[PDB]
Write an enzyme that holds these catalytic residues in place. Structure first.
Site, PDB file in Angstrom:
ATOM      1  N   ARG A  45       1.473 -24.704  -6.796  1.00 55.59           N
ATOM      2  CA  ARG A  45       0.432 -25.711  -6.455  1.00 55.59           C
ATOM      3  C   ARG A  45       1.027 -26.467  -5.196  1.00 55.59           C
ATOM      4  NH1 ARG A  45       0.214 -30.584 -10.755  1.00 55.59           N
ATOM      5  NH2 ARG A  45      -1.683 -29.666 -11.410  1.00 55.59           N
ATOM      6  N   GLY A  46       0.287 -26.733  -3.923  1.00 56.40           N
ATOM      7  CA  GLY A  46       0.502 -27.522  -2.915  1.00 56.40           C
ATOM      8  C   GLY A  46      -0.062 -28.944  -2.973  1.00 56.40           C
ATOM      9  N   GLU A  50      -4.195 -25.450  -6.006  1.00 60.16           N
ATOM     10  CA  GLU A  50      -3.558 -24.981  -7.099  1.00 60.16           C
ATOM     11  C   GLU A  50      -3.975 -23.416  -7.094  1.00 60.16           C
ATOM     12  OE1 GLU A  50      -4.366 -26.927 -11.094  1.00 60.16           O
ATOM     13  OE2 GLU A  50      -2.247 -27.378 -10.458  1.00 60.16           O
ATOM     14  N   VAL A  51      -2.894 -22.522  -7.158  1.00 62.60           N
ATOM     15  CA  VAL A  51      -3.224 -21.184  -7.225  1.00 62.60           C
ATOM     16  C   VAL A  51      -2.765 -20.510  -8.439  1.00 62.60           C
ATOM     17  CG1 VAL A  51      -2.193 -19.257  -5.909  1.00 62.60           C
ATOM     18  CG2 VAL A  51      -2.655 -21.173  -4.360  1.00 62.60           C
ATOM     19  N   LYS A  66      -7.419 -19.462  -5.402  1.00 63.29           N
ATOM     20  CA  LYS A  66      -6.957 -20.817  -5.094  1.00 63.29           C
ATOM     21  C   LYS A  66      -7.844 -21.998  -5.056  1.00 63.29           C
ATOM     22  CE  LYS A  66      -5.266 -22.349  -0.526  1.00 63.29           C
ATOM     23  NZ  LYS A  66      -5.084 -22.001   1.107  1.00 63.29           N
ATOM     24  N   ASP A 154       1.024 -22.869  10.340  1.00 61.78           N
ATOM     25  CA  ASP A 154       1.883 -22.837   9.316  1.00 61.78           C
ATOM     26  C   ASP A 154       2.727 -21.436   8.973  1.00 61.78           C
ATOM     27  OD1 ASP A 154       3.272 -24.442   7.273  1.00 61.78           O
ATOM     28  OD2 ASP A 154       1.470 -24.138   6.045  1.00 61.78           O
TER      29      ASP A 154
HETATM   30  C1  LIG Z   1       8.792 -19.936  -9.591  1.00 61.37           C
HETATM   31  C2  LIG Z   1       7.791 -19.641  -8.471  1.00 61.37           C
HETATM   32  C3  LIG Z   1       7.991 -18.347  -7.846  1.00 61.37           C
HETATM   33  N1  LIG Z   1       7.700 -20.843  -7.756  1.00 61.37           N
HETATM   34  C4  LIG Z   1       6.270 -21.208  -7.589  1.00 61.37           C
HETATM   35  O1  LIG Z   1       6.040 -22.498  -7.914  1.00 61.37           O
HETATM   36  C5  LIG Z   1       5.303 -20.728  -6.576  1.00 61.37           C
HETATM   37  O2  LIG Z   1       5.365 -19.374  -6.786  1.00 61.37           O
HETATM   38  C6  LIG Z   1       4.345 -18.481  -6.080  1.00 61.37           C
HETATM   39  C7  LIG Z   1       4.262 -17.273  -6.255  1.00 61.37           C
HETATM   40  C8  LIG Z   1       3.208 -16.560  -5.746  1.00 61.37           C
HETATM   41  C9  LIG Z   1       2.518 -17.049  -4.871  1.00 61.37           C
HETATM   42  C10 LIG Z   1       2.463 -18.469  -4.656  1.00 61.37           C
HETATM   43  C11 LIG Z   1       1.641 -19.089  -3.913  1.00 61.37           C
HETATM   44  N2  LIG Z   1       0.620 -18.296  -3.162  1.00 61.37           N
HETATM   45  C12 LIG Z   1      -0.517 -18.895  -2.447  1.00 61.37           C
HETATM   46  N3  LIG Z   1      -1.460 -18.277  -2.057  1.00 61.37           N
HETATM   47  C13 LIG Z   1      -1.543 -16.959  -2.440  1.00 61.37           C
HETATM   48  C14 LIG Z   1      -2.988 -16.357  -1.844  1.00 61.37           C
HETATM   49  C15 LIG Z   1      -3.307 -14.972  -1.934  1.00 61.37           C
HETATM   50  C16 LIG Z   1      -2.504 -14.183  -2.679  1.00 61.37           C
HETATM   51  N4  LIG Z   1      -2.480 -12.802  -2.952  1.00 61.37           N
HETATM   52  N5  LIG Z   1      -1.463 -12.542  -3.530  1.00 61.37           N
HETATM   53  C17 LIG Z   1      -0.574 -13.495  -3.700  1.00 61.37           C
HETATM   54  C18 LIG Z   1      -1.305 -14.632  -3.155  1.00 61.37           C
HETATM   55  C19 LIG Z   1      -0.794 -15.972  -3.088  1.00 61.37           C
HETATM   56  C20 LIG Z   1      -0.451 -20.459  -2.326  1.00 61.37           C
HETATM   57  C21 LIG Z   1      -1.430 -21.076  -1.351  1.00 61.37           C
HETATM   58  C22 LIG Z   1      -1.187 -22.350  -1.240  1.00 61.37           C
HETATM   59  C23 LIG Z   1      -0.175 -23.108  -1.839  1.00 61.37           C
HETATM   60  C24 LIG Z   1       0.633 -22.616  -2.789  1.00 61.37           C
HETATM   61  C25 LIG Z   1       0.659 -21.056  -2.902  1.00 61.37           C
HETATM   62  N6  LIG Z   1       1.450 -20.589  -3.757  1.00 61.37           N
HETATM   63  C26 LIG Z   1       3.476 -19.238  -5.261  1.00 61.37           C
END
Ligand SMILES: CC(C)NC(=O)COc1cccc(-c2nc(Nc3ccc4[nH]ncc4c3)c3ccccc3n2)c1
Length: 327
Positions: A45-46, A50-51, A66, A154
Protein backbone atom coordinates in the site's frame (compact mmCIF):
# COMPACT_ATOMS: atom_id res chain seq x y z
CA UNK A 1 13.30 36.66 -9.26
CA UNK A 2 14.87 33.27 -10.19
CA UNK A 3 16.79 32.89 -13.55
CA UNK A 4 15.02 30.37 -15.84
CA UNK A 5 16.45 26.96 -16.73
CA UNK A 6 16.04 24.41 -19.59
CA UNK A 7 17.25 20.83 -19.98
CA UNK A 8 20.42 20.52 -22.06
CA UNK A 9 18.88 17.41 -23.79
CA UNK A 10 15.40 16.40 -25.15
CA UNK A 11 14.32 20.06 -24.64
CA UNK A 12 11.70 20.12 -27.39
CA UNK A 13 10.48 16.44 -27.67
CA UNK A 14 6.97 17.37 -26.38
CA UNK A 15 6.67 20.74 -28.28
CA UNK A 16 6.98 18.64 -31.56
CA UNK A 17 4.62 15.72 -30.72
CA UNK A 18 0.87 16.01 -31.40
CA UNK A 19 -1.05 17.14 -28.27
CA UNK A 20 -2.35 13.46 -28.29
CA UNK A 21 1.06 12.43 -26.80
CA UNK A 22 1.36 14.82 -23.77
CA UNK A 23 -2.21 16.24 -23.29
CA UNK A 24 -3.08 13.43 -20.83
CA UNK A 25 -6.38 15.18 -19.80
CA UNK A 26 -7.82 14.53 -23.36
CA UNK A 27 -6.84 10.81 -23.28
CA UNK A 28 -9.74 8.25 -23.49
CA UNK A 29 -9.05 5.03 -21.45
CA UNK A 30 -9.63 1.69 -23.31
CA UNK A 31 -11.13 -0.65 -20.63
CA UNK A 32 -10.27 -4.37 -20.50
CA UNK A 33 -12.34 -7.08 -18.76
CA UNK A 34 -12.03 -6.89 -14.89
CA UNK A 35 -13.16 -10.61 -14.86
CA UNK A 36 -9.82 -11.58 -16.54
CA UNK A 37 -8.03 -10.85 -13.21
CA UNK A 38 -8.36 -12.63 -9.85
CA UNK A 39 -6.60 -11.00 -6.86
CA UNK A 40 -4.35 -13.47 -4.95
CA UNK A 41 -2.80 -11.38 -2.13
CA UNK A 42 -2.06 -7.78 -1.11
CA UNK A 43 1.66 -6.93 -1.88
CA UNK A 44 1.82 -3.27 -0.75
CA UNK A 45 0.00 0.00 0.00
CA UNK A 46 1.20 3.58 -0.74
CA UNK A 47 -0.58 6.87 -0.11
CA UNK A 48 -2.08 6.70 -3.60
CA UNK A 49 -2.56 2.97 -4.23
CA UNK A 50 -2.92 -0.64 -3.09
CA UNK A 51 -0.93 -3.26 -5.00
CA UNK A 52 -1.94 -6.96 -5.35
CA UNK A 53 -0.47 -10.15 -6.73
CA UNK A 54 -3.12 -11.42 -9.16
CA UNK A 55 -3.63 -14.07 -11.85
CA UNK A 56 -4.72 -13.50 -15.44
CA UNK A 57 -7.21 -16.44 -15.72
CA UNK A 58 -7.16 -16.18 -19.59
CA UNK A 59 -3.49 -17.39 -19.72
CA UNK A 60 -2.73 -18.43 -16.06
CA UNK A 61 0.03 -15.72 -15.93
CA UNK A 62 0.93 -13.83 -12.72
CA UNK A 63 0.24 -10.07 -12.90
CA UNK A 64 0.39 -7.14 -10.48
CA UNK A 65 -2.73 -5.02 -10.06
CA UNK A 66 -2.43 -1.45 -8.73
CA UNK A 67 -5.80 -0.08 -7.56
CA UNK A 68 -5.61 3.71 -7.39
CA UNK A 69 -7.10 5.34 -4.26
CA UNK A 70 -9.59 8.12 -5.28
CA UNK A 71 -7.08 10.48 -3.58
CA UNK A 72 -5.04 10.30 -6.80
CA UNK A 73 -7.36 13.23 -7.56
CA UNK A 74 -7.82 12.14 -11.21
CA UNK A 75 -4.05 12.42 -11.99
CA UNK A 76 -4.64 8.74 -12.77
CA UNK A 77 -4.77 9.86 -16.41
CA UNK A 78 -1.16 11.24 -16.36
CA UNK A 79 0.17 7.90 -15.05
CA UNK A 80 -1.86 5.89 -17.60
CA UNK A 81 -0.76 8.15 -20.47
CA UNK A 82 2.91 8.01 -19.37
CA UNK A 83 2.75 4.18 -18.97
CA UNK A 84 1.17 3.82 -22.45
CA UNK A 85 3.71 6.24 -24.05
CA UNK A 86 6.68 4.29 -22.49
CA UNK A 87 5.28 0.76 -22.98
CA UNK A 88 7.92 -1.61 -24.46
CA UNK A 89 10.78 0.77 -23.57
CA UNK A 90 13.89 -0.91 -22.08
CA UNK A 91 13.33 -1.84 -18.41
CA UNK A 92 10.02 0.16 -18.28
CA UNK A 93 7.34 -1.77 -16.31
CA UNK A 94 4.80 -3.01 -18.91
CA UNK A 95 1.15 -1.92 -18.40
CA UNK A 96 -0.76 -5.02 -19.67
CA UNK A 97 -4.34 -3.74 -19.05
CA UNK A 98 -6.60 -1.13 -17.40
CA UNK A 99 -9.84 -2.50 -15.85
CA UNK A 100 -12.47 -0.79 -13.65
CA UNK A 101 -12.25 -2.18 -10.06
CA UNK A 102 -15.82 -3.09 -9.00
CA UNK A 103 -15.17 -2.34 -5.30
CA UNK A 104 -13.15 0.94 -5.43
CA UNK A 105 -14.89 2.06 -8.72
CA UNK A 106 -11.39 3.42 -9.68
CA UNK A 107 -9.02 2.28 -12.47
CA UNK A 108 -6.92 -0.81 -11.67
CA UNK A 109 -3.61 -0.87 -13.63
CA UNK A 110 -2.52 -4.41 -14.59
CA UNK A 111 1.27 -4.85 -14.93
CA UNK A 112 3.64 -7.66 -15.86
CA UNK A 113 4.87 -9.47 -12.73
CA UNK A 114 8.55 -9.17 -11.73
CA UNK A 115 9.61 -11.82 -9.16
CA UNK A 116 11.32 -9.09 -6.98
CA UNK A 117 13.86 -9.88 -4.19
CA UNK A 118 13.84 -7.30 -1.27
CA UNK A 119 16.25 -4.29 -1.80
CA UNK A 120 17.24 -4.22 1.96
CA UNK A 121 18.43 -7.86 1.33
CA UNK A 122 19.70 -7.10 -2.27
CA UNK A 123 21.15 -3.56 -3.01
CA UNK A 124 23.40 -3.72 0.08
CA UNK A 125 24.60 -7.27 -0.83
CA UNK A 126 25.42 -6.97 -4.58
CA UNK A 127 28.90 -7.41 -6.06
CA UNK A 128 30.92 -4.58 -7.71
CA UNK A 129 30.02 -6.18 -11.06
CA UNK A 130 26.28 -6.44 -10.19
CA UNK A 131 26.11 -2.75 -9.04
CA UNK A 132 27.56 -1.72 -12.44
CA UNK A 133 25.26 -4.13 -14.34
CA UNK A 134 22.01 -2.97 -12.62
CA UNK A 135 22.95 0.74 -12.77
CA UNK A 136 23.39 0.30 -16.57
CA UNK A 137 19.91 -1.32 -16.75
CA UNK A 138 18.42 1.63 -14.76
CA UNK A 139 20.14 4.12 -17.13
CA UNK A 140 18.48 2.39 -20.13
CA UNK A 141 15.08 3.09 -18.50
CA UNK A 142 15.95 6.71 -17.64
CA UNK A 143 17.42 7.61 -21.03
CA UNK A 144 14.37 6.04 -22.67
CA UNK A 145 11.83 7.98 -20.59
CA UNK A 146 13.89 11.27 -20.85
CA UNK A 147 14.12 10.74 -24.67
CA UNK A 148 10.31 10.39 -24.63
CA UNK A 149 9.87 13.76 -22.83
CA UNK A 150 9.13 12.25 -19.36
CA UNK A 151 10.79 12.70 -15.97
CA UNK A 152 10.15 9.93 -13.36
CA UNK A 153 10.64 12.19 -10.27
CA UNK A 154 10.64 9.23 -7.82
CA UNK A 155 13.85 7.25 -8.52
CA UNK A 156 14.71 5.22 -5.38
CA UNK A 157 15.49 1.57 -4.58
CA UNK A 158 11.81 0.75 -3.74
CA UNK A 159 10.81 1.75 -7.34
CA UNK A 160 13.34 -0.63 -8.96
CA UNK A 161 12.01 -4.24 -9.13
CA UNK A 162 14.80 -6.80 -9.73
CA UNK A 163 14.44 -10.51 -10.45
CA UNK A 164 18.06 -11.25 -9.42
CA UNK A 165 17.73 -14.89 -10.73
CA UNK A 166 16.94 -13.71 -14.36
CA UNK A 167 19.06 -10.50 -14.13
CA UNK A 168 15.84 -8.63 -14.95
CA UNK A 169 15.11 -5.02 -13.86
CA UNK A 170 11.97 -2.80 -14.16
CA UNK A 171 11.49 0.83 -13.14
CA UNK A 172 8.01 1.09 -11.54
CA UNK A 173 5.66 3.64 -9.85
CA UNK A 174 5.23 6.29 -12.55
CA UNK A 175 2.55 8.03 -10.42
CA UNK A 176 4.82 11.08 -9.85
CA UNK A 177 6.15 11.13 -13.43
CA UNK A 178 5.54 14.27 -15.54
CA UNK A 179 5.96 15.53 -19.13
CA UNK A 180 8.88 17.94 -19.48
CA UNK A 181 7.90 21.23 -21.13
CA UNK A 182 10.67 23.86 -21.39
CA UNK A 183 10.04 26.86 -19.10
CA UNK A 184 7.26 25.04 -17.08
CA UNK A 185 7.37 25.41 -13.27
CA UNK A 186 6.81 22.07 -11.49
CA UNK A 187 5.87 21.08 -7.91
CA UNK A 188 9.03 20.62 -5.75
CA UNK A 189 7.09 18.14 -3.48
CA UNK A 190 8.27 15.07 -5.49
CA UNK A 191 10.80 12.25 -4.84
CA UNK A 192 11.43 10.68 -1.43
CA UNK A 193 13.37 12.84 1.13
CA UNK A 194 16.77 11.04 0.81
CA UNK A 195 16.66 11.16 -3.06
CA UNK A 196 15.42 14.80 -3.39
CA UNK A 197 17.74 16.91 -5.58
CA UNK A 198 19.08 20.26 -4.31
CA UNK A 199 16.74 22.06 -6.79
CA UNK A 200 13.73 20.66 -4.82
CA UNK A 201 15.31 21.46 -1.44
CA UNK A 202 15.96 25.14 -2.41
CA UNK A 203 12.42 25.43 -3.96
CA UNK A 204 13.62 25.88 -7.59
CA UNK A 205 10.57 24.90 -9.72
CA UNK A 206 12.03 25.03 -13.29
CA UNK A 207 13.79 21.63 -13.01
CA UNK A 208 14.01 18.81 -15.59
CA UNK A 209 15.15 15.20 -16.30
CA UNK A 210 18.43 15.90 -14.41
CA UNK A 211 16.48 15.54 -11.08
CA UNK A 212 16.39 11.75 -11.83
CA UNK A 213 20.20 11.75 -12.24
CA UNK A 214 20.65 13.24 -8.73
CA UNK A 215 18.32 10.51 -7.31
CA UNK A 216 20.34 7.84 -9.20
CA UNK A 217 23.58 9.28 -7.75
CA UNK A 218 22.06 8.97 -4.22
CA UNK A 219 21.31 5.26 -5.00
CA UNK A 220 24.87 4.66 -6.30
CA UNK A 221 26.53 6.29 -3.25
CA UNK A 222 24.45 4.14 -0.86
CA UNK A 223 25.41 0.97 -2.80
CA UNK A 224 29.20 1.55 -3.27
CA UNK A 225 29.71 2.98 0.26
CA UNK A 226 27.27 0.55 1.94
CA UNK A 227 25.47 3.48 3.65
CA UNK A 228 21.63 3.57 3.68
CA UNK A 229 20.72 6.23 2.94
CA UNK A 230 23.80 8.19 1.86
CA UNK A 231 22.33 11.65 2.74
CA UNK A 232 20.37 10.97 5.95
CA UNK A 233 18.26 14.13 6.55
CA UNK A 234 15.97 14.34 9.62
CA UNK A 235 13.62 16.51 7.45
CA UNK A 236 13.76 18.43 4.09
CA UNK A 237 15.88 21.26 5.67
CA UNK A 238 18.39 18.95 7.32
CA UNK A 239 18.45 17.00 3.99
CA UNK A 240 20.16 20.01 2.34
CA UNK A 241 22.56 20.39 5.35
CA UNK A 242 23.55 16.69 4.99
CA UNK A 243 24.31 17.31 1.27
CA UNK A 244 26.26 20.48 2.10
CA UNK A 245 28.45 18.56 4.66
CA UNK A 246 29.70 16.45 1.70
CA UNK A 247 29.62 18.78 -1.36
CA UNK A 248 30.41 21.94 0.66
CA UNK A 249 28.60 25.25 1.17
CA UNK A 250 30.67 27.35 -1.32
CA UNK A 251 29.38 25.34 -4.35
CA UNK A 252 25.85 25.53 -2.86
CA UNK A 253 26.06 29.35 -2.72
CA UNK A 254 27.45 29.45 -6.31
CA UNK A 255 24.45 27.29 -7.43
CA UNK A 256 21.71 29.42 -5.83
CA UNK A 257 23.65 32.62 -6.97
CA UNK A 258 23.66 31.32 -10.62
CA UNK A 259 19.86 30.80 -10.59
CA UNK A 260 19.19 33.96 -8.45
CA UNK A 261 17.48 31.70 -5.78
CA UNK A 262 17.07 33.01 -2.21
CA UNK A 263 17.62 30.25 0.43
CA UNK A 264 14.76 29.97 2.94
CA UNK A 265 16.11 32.09 5.85
CA UNK A 266 15.47 28.98 8.11
CA UNK A 267 18.89 27.83 6.71
CA UNK A 268 20.91 30.79 8.25
CA UNK A 269 21.00 29.06 11.73
CA UNK A 270 21.57 25.41 10.50
CA UNK A 271 23.63 25.32 7.25
CA UNK A 272 27.03 26.38 8.73
CA UNK A 273 30.24 26.50 6.65
CA UNK A 274 31.46 23.22 5.10
CA UNK A 275 34.31 22.26 2.79
CA UNK A 276 33.75 19.83 -0.09
CA UNK A 277 34.94 16.41 1.13
CA UNK A 278 37.02 14.04 -0.98
CA UNK A 279 35.04 10.84 -1.81
CA UNK A 280 37.86 8.72 -0.15
CA UNK A 281 36.58 9.83 3.30
CA UNK A 282 33.59 7.43 2.84
CA UNK A 283 35.76 4.38 1.94
CA UNK A 284 36.40 1.80 4.68
CA UNK A 285 37.31 -1.88 4.96
CA UNK A 286 33.67 -3.01 4.52
CA UNK A 287 33.00 -1.15 1.20
CA UNK A 288 36.46 -0.81 -0.44
CA UNK A 289 35.72 -3.81 -2.74
CA UNK A 290 32.85 -1.76 -4.31
CA UNK A 291 34.92 1.42 -4.76
CA UNK A 292 37.15 2.20 -7.79
CA UNK A 293 38.49 5.43 -9.31
CA UNK A 294 35.88 4.93 -12.10
CA UNK A 295 33.03 4.55 -9.53
CA UNK A 296 34.08 7.77 -7.72
CA UNK A 297 34.50 9.77 -10.98
CA UNK A 298 31.02 8.63 -12.12
CA UNK A 299 29.41 9.43 -8.72
CA UNK A 300 31.18 12.83 -8.69
CA UNK A 301 29.52 13.74 -12.03
CA UNK A 302 25.96 12.80 -10.82
CA UNK A 303 26.07 14.45 -7.38
CA UNK A 304 26.44 18.08 -8.45
CA UNK A 305 24.31 20.89 -7.08
CA UNK A 306 23.92 22.50 -10.55
CA UNK A 307 21.27 20.34 -12.28
CA UNK A 308 22.58 21.57 -15.68
CA UNK A 309 26.11 20.18 -14.94
CA UNK A 310 25.11 16.58 -14.07
CA UNK A 311 25.72 13.72 -16.51
CA UNK A 312 22.65 12.94 -18.68
CA UNK A 313 21.51 9.28 -18.73
CA UNK A 314 23.08 8.85 -22.21
CA UNK A 315 26.42 10.44 -21.09
CA UNK A 316 26.33 8.25 -17.97
CA UNK A 317 26.08 5.08 -20.13
CA UNK A 318 29.35 6.14 -21.92
CA UNK A 319 31.27 6.32 -18.58
CA UNK A 320 34.33 4.08 -17.95
CA UNK A 321 32.54 2.66 -14.86
CA UNK A 322 30.47 0.56 -17.33
CA UNK A 323 33.35 -0.66 -19.58
CA UNK A 324 33.46 -3.96 -17.57
CA UNK A 325 29.69 -4.61 -18.08
CA UNK A 326 28.94 -7.18 -20.82
CA UNK A 327 26.92 -5.50 -23.63
C1 LIG B 1 6.92 -7.24 3.40
C2 LIG B 1 6.80 -6.54 2.06
C3 LIG B 1 8.01 -6.79 1.19
N1 LIG B 1 6.63 -5.10 2.27
C4 LIG B 1 5.63 -4.40 1.73
O1 LIG B 1 4.71 -3.95 2.40
C5 LIG B 1 5.67 -4.16 0.24
O2 LIG B 1 6.16 -5.27 -0.50
C6 LIG B 1 6.14 -5.18 -1.86
C7 LIG B 1 6.59 -6.24 -2.62
C8 LIG B 1 6.54 -6.15 -4.00
C9 LIG B 1 6.03 -5.02 -4.61
C10 LIG B 1 5.57 -3.95 -3.85
C11 LIG B 1 4.99 -2.75 -4.51
N2 LIG B 1 4.96 -2.76 -5.85
C12 LIG B 1 4.44 -1.71 -6.48
N3 LIG B 1 4.21 -1.80 -7.81
C13 LIG B 1 4.49 -2.84 -8.72
C14 LIG B 1 4.06 -2.69 -10.04
C15 LIG B 1 4.30 -3.67 -10.98
C16 LIG B 1 5.01 -4.80 -10.59
N4 LIG B 1 5.41 -5.89 -11.28
N5 LIG B 1 6.11 -6.76 -10.50
C17 LIG B 1 6.15 -6.21 -9.30
C18 LIG B 1 5.47 -4.96 -9.28
C19 LIG B 1 5.20 -3.97 -8.33
C20 LIG B 1 3.97 -0.56 -5.75
C21 LIG B 1 3.45 0.62 -6.31
C22 LIG B 1 2.99 1.63 -5.51
C23 LIG B 1 3.03 1.51 -4.14
C24 LIG B 1 3.54 0.39 -3.55
C25 LIG B 1 4.04 -0.67 -4.34
N6 LIG B 1 4.55 -1.78 -3.72
C26 LIG B 1 5.64 -4.03 -2.46
Amino acid sequence: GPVPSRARVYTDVNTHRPSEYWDYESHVVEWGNQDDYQLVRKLGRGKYSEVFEAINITNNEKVVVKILKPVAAAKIKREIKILENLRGGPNIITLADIVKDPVSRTPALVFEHVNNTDFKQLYQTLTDYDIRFYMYEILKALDYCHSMGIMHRDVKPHNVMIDHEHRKLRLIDWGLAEFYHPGQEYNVRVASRYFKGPELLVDYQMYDYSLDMWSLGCMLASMIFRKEPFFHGHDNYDQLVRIAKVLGTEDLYDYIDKYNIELDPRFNDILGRHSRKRWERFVHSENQHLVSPEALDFLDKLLRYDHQSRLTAREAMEHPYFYTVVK
